[PDB]
Design a protein around this nucleic acid. Structure first.
Lengths: 363, 142
RNA sequence: ACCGAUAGCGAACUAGUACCGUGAGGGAAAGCUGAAAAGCACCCCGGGAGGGGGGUGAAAAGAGCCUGAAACCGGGCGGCGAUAGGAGGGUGCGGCCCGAAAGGAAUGAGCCUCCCCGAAGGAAACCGCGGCGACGCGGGAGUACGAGGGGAGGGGACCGG
RNA sequence: CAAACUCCGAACCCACCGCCGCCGUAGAUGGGGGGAGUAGGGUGGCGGUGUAAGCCGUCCACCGAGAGGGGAACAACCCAGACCGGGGUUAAGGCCCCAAAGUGCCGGCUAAGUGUUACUCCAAAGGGUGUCCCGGGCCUUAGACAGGUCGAGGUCCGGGGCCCCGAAAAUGGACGGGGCUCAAGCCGGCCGCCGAGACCCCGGCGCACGGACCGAUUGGUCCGUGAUCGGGUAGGCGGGCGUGCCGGUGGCGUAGAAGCCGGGCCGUAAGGUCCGGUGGAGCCGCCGGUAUCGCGGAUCCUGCCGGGAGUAGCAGCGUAGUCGGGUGAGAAUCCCGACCGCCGGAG
RNA sequence: AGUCGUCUCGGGCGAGAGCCCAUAUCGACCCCGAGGCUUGCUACCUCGCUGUCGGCUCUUCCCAUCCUGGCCCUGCAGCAGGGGCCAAGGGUGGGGGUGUUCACCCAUUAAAGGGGAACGUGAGCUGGGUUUAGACCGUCGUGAGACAGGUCGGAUGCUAUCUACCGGGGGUGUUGGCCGCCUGAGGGGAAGGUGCCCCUAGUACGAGAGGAACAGGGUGCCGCGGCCUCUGGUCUACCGGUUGUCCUCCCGGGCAUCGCCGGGCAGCUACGCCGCAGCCGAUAAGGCCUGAAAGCAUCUAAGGCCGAAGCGGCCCCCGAAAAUAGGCGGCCGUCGAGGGCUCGGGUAGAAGACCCGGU
């Protein structure tokens, strides 16, 4: 008989709707330097640039076209510290401490006709995600809880520590409900990690402070949804003979006589898209500040194309320009981590030479 | 509730005795499942356990024999094989068994029972491998 | 000494009637209020059909009418009820429930105690000896016990089903 | 060398006579009459035939027409042939757990998970300083071989036990499973204990035969024997239960008949009879006769009612309605006006 | 289904061919086996109905391995060959005649392996061959007619009852309820496979012709998972030209496939663009070290080292119903935290569900 590879891959089954619209990171890289291992942003749109290639290959030193994706990256708020001990079958959280309520200043309040400014505060936007926050939680209580956690670390029951951070869509005026994420910290010593998280508890983190230009990353997000799709589109089966009187976009035979059952491997219709996916080795071309990209120390250009990004507003905060495309619809929350399985001859860790940036109307 | 240290005990004989205890309504806790021994040839034992692991249902992997890869799970399944697992009595008996690797702090400082009828001193030649070695070859956690 | 409304002639009745086929021709189903209509006067609700009161009748037998089985469906009651496998049952008992009559039983139930005889069968403590050993041999002993067959004492309501 | 050869020749089979044993006057061998069913057999041992499966006969052991206890299930293999209620001991075989009974005892072997298979299923020719042994040999304890010097046993051959290679298949998986290495495997034995409806005992029923007594139509009560009675398909024979009607006999019922729902009791049973409801008019016991006399099937007949199911369909050839007003209990679906449409060689 | 005569594939012995040399390779005459992939034999199940060959679609498995990974012998100088071993992760393609399976042939390629799954797959398709009813030719028959001989034509029914797999929801339980973030027992994966080019190098080898390899770089193809910045399709939103007819003509409209035609942003798309680890651990075939049985020798009996695209992990996806039914922070209870319907919308969608917003 004639052989051929099977239609589609079995390594992404079941092809079901993602458990949570907020992506989860299962594995983290091993880095000596002490820093947060990743960041979060919102997908804005796509554009292209012309750059002198510095990555190894045939096209080295020659100007090349390059598509890039824009992620708006408002600063994250570090508002929790969590500790992990070693359980019987794996890591188990031992304790977790969140900072007490503090006033919120970066809220873009508007003065409407009547009434004063809303005068928002933390624990008020966070309620939209948690809905059950501490009451009468004071600085002394927080200090004693931190001391207890530090004493536990000193005793040595703690094998890991991680940071609880929150997004701030309100500063960019996207929405108000924040997304809470848990991030591992690079390094080796739990004491160093604890000090690093503690010094930033209740404060802000910037992608400029976290990541490095020209480094490889992995992008995690939930892909665009397609609804129910037949096998032709879901798995890539071949259309049946044009003379078929019972349809063309269906599998011919769903199994032999024996086994007397339908094998799970037979392509079939179902959910397509909205899957949790990870893309490896995506280069971080640039990091821009306040929606502006600096080219030659005397030229700066607004990254927003004329008329704005389609189905998106205007980039007003820090942002990331990455090579290639990324999963997720527009405005999706995108997580990025340092390269987990990078190649051996990596590109230099520095911004490339960008000769042109496209800001023409993309609509 | 009896606690048995499995160090230096033949897996099959220990399992037979423990299953007999379980069928009479006695709670049992094995504390060193990784230190049990299996007599025979290393390659034969490893091949048998690999075959057991690769046994699976073709129509649906979510239903095939979930044979174990950990030491404690291996001991648990060995004991289960000797119980009337298809009956309510056997199921209740199996619900009365706990198996652990190493001594957890919970069971620390407690009497450890040993089975004379299953010690390695019986064997003429100590040609065996440990359940921990089998688990390591299988790729289990411990 | 035939049948008793799926029986007896096809027709117990507006039956060779209604209906089927151009035609020759073929051909059903369908009995019962009550003794007397005394066949529900009046009131409330409802568009109506009808429903709830209230009357008639020995009995609604209420005309959709003598009796009103089974299948099937709805509600209440008692049992099980979301980690469990076999043609839906057989043997034994245990939970929950029912238990006036026809079955036993206050002229004593389950139950508790004690005494006697007991077919086939049938131990051990301990003593001595044989065997490398598992163990066996003689006494204890044909003893304790033994299906069943009887008797006495206490209590006072269950047992069978 | 011989199925179509035999100078010889068994085991063994057959006929007859004497005897032991058994059966028989409670009547055999034998004879007469009535009624059948059976004319596809299967497994197992043997013989002819065939590469083999198989085909064709023969043997009458088992299933057919056979329960119970085992071989994992299994027709046929092992024990075993069975009336009902109890007690005990054994058979096949079994005793590490599943699972009642030993992680039982002595001597030896196996390192292959070989095996854990009495038979229904089971791989060979050929080879192995792999091990444990037996029997023959030639040299043979300062002398024999390994490399004229050491200085303890060598060098062959023919065999026996276990094991090893020879040994490749299709869904994932088969010693029944777990698992098992001085064993939970295999050899030569042994000792305890479990384990049937089998064997023994107690009480009960029926049956066959004999006996006593007693019935006004086939019989009834009791007694004696049964180690030599108790499975059962085709079929033969005896007794009994139930329904309609008729000739008798004795009765019940409006103080509630037949019928119908749920319970108690009796009968090994077909069933009968009682208690509690509904019903309002007939009904039954016993004897002797009669019959369209007994329901699960016939892709049975007539009637009724279920799951499929509140599902399919209410598209395709001409996709047609909307806004105000009226009517009316109720209006997408009826009526009027306007607007938008369809056929327009037929709509 | 049983059997394996036959079929396919192995083994024992070694006459002989190989300049000598039986075993580099072939191996007579004989003999012992494995599989059930050819055909046959039997008649055990199925004739109150289990629809055939071939092709397309799709899924999966065996090794007696064609290539891809690693090795041993060679009558193995190199480049290549012959024989053999471990190894089933991946590939094994496109066409011409013919209904063809098969076989033959063409151009590429590392290769274009043989088979099992009711000779897999017709409640999935097609109906070319086969096997009715019509008809023609040849041959046989007096004839009606026949031909495992050609030839033309000749229908393919379905509202899913249970289970199965694909995805989507509502509950119970997990010793009170609720919001959030996690752990990862287990299951799935090929997420990767494979060519060519440049240097090493016109070097090793070789008389010459010819002609490697380790290491180091580049890139293609097949497969997989994403995206719409660029290019192409569509775009019955939209703008324009125009034909026939009607609204009386002018503007502006209806119908004629969106009347026809050209362009067309958002959206979807591929013919477009981006991403896909070689490291560690133990091994098979195979190569060695120490060492006796058997004072020597010996890779093996005890013991140790290295050694495969194959096995386990790193990695990706699902994952508290993981019955040992999990961990932690917080809020509430012993009126009341936290939710649902209703409301404005898609980062979503068959109903559910999910996501933003709600003074």
């Amino acid at each position: 008989k004639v052989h051929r590879p099977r239609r589609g891959s079995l390594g992404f089954s079941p092809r079901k709707r993602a458990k949570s619209i907020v992506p989860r990171i299962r594995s983290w890289p091993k880095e000596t330097e002490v820093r947060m291992l990743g960041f979060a942003g919102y997908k804005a749109g796509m554009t292209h640039i012309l750059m002198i290639d510095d990555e190894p290959g045939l096209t080295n030193g020659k100007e090349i076209f390059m598509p890039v994706t824009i992620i708006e990256t408002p600063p994250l708020r570090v508002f929790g510290i969590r500790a992990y001990r070693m359980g019987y079958l794996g890591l188990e959280t031992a304790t977790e401490v969140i900072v007490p309520d503090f006033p919120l200043d970066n809220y873009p309040a508007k003065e409407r006709k009547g009434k004063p400014k809303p005068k928002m505060t933390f624990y008020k936007l966070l309620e939209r995600r948690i809905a059950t926050l501490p009451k009468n939680y004071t600085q002394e209580m927080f200090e004693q809880k931190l001391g207890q956690l530090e004493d536990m670390i000193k005793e040595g029951e703690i094998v890991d520590v991680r940071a609880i951070v929150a997004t701030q869509p309100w500063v960019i005026k996207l929405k108000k409900k924040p997304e809470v994420m848990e991030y591992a910290i690079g390094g080796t010593s739990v004491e160093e990690k604890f000090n690093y998280i503690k010094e930033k508890l209740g404060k802000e983190l910037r992608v400029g402070e976290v990541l490095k230009e020209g480094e490889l990353l992995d992008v995690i997000a939930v892909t665009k949804g397609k609804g129910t799709q037949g096998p032709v589109k879901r798995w890539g089966i071949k259309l049946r003979a044009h003379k078929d009187s019972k349809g063309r976009r269906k599998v011919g035979s769903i199994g032999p006589w024996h086994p007397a059952r339908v094998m799970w491997t037979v392509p079939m219709a179902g959910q397509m898209g909205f899957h949790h996916r990870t893309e490896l080795n995506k280069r971080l071309i640039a990091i821009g500040e306040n929606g502006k990209l600096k080219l030659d120390e005397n030229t700066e250009i607004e990254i927003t194309p004329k008329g704005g990004f389609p189905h998106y507003g205007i980039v007003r905060s820090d942002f990331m320009m990455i090579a290639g495309s990324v999963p997720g619809a527009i405005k999706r929350i995108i997580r990025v981590r340092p390269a987990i399985r990078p190649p051996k001859k990596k590109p230099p860790v520095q911004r490339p030479q960008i000769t042109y940036v496209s800001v023409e109307s993309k609509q | 509730m009896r606690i048995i240290n499995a160090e230096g005990l033949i897996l099959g004989r220990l399992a037979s005795k423990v299953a007999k205890m379980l069928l009479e309504g006695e709670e049992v806790v094995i504390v060193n499942a990784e230190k049990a021994v299996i007599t025979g040839n290393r390659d034969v034992i490893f091949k048998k356990y690999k075959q057991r692991t690769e046994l699976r249902t073709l129509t649906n992997p979510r239903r095939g024999p979930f044979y174990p890869k950990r030491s404690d799970e291996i001991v648990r399944r060995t004991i289960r094989g000797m119980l009337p697992w298809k009956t309510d009595r056997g199921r209740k008996a199996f619900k009365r068994l706990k198996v652990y690797v190493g001594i957890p702090k919970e069971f620390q400082g407690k009497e450890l029972e040993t089975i004379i009828e299953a010690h390695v001193s019986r064997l003429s030649r100590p040609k065996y491998v440990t359940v921990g070695e089998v688990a390591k070859f299988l790729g289990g956690k411990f």
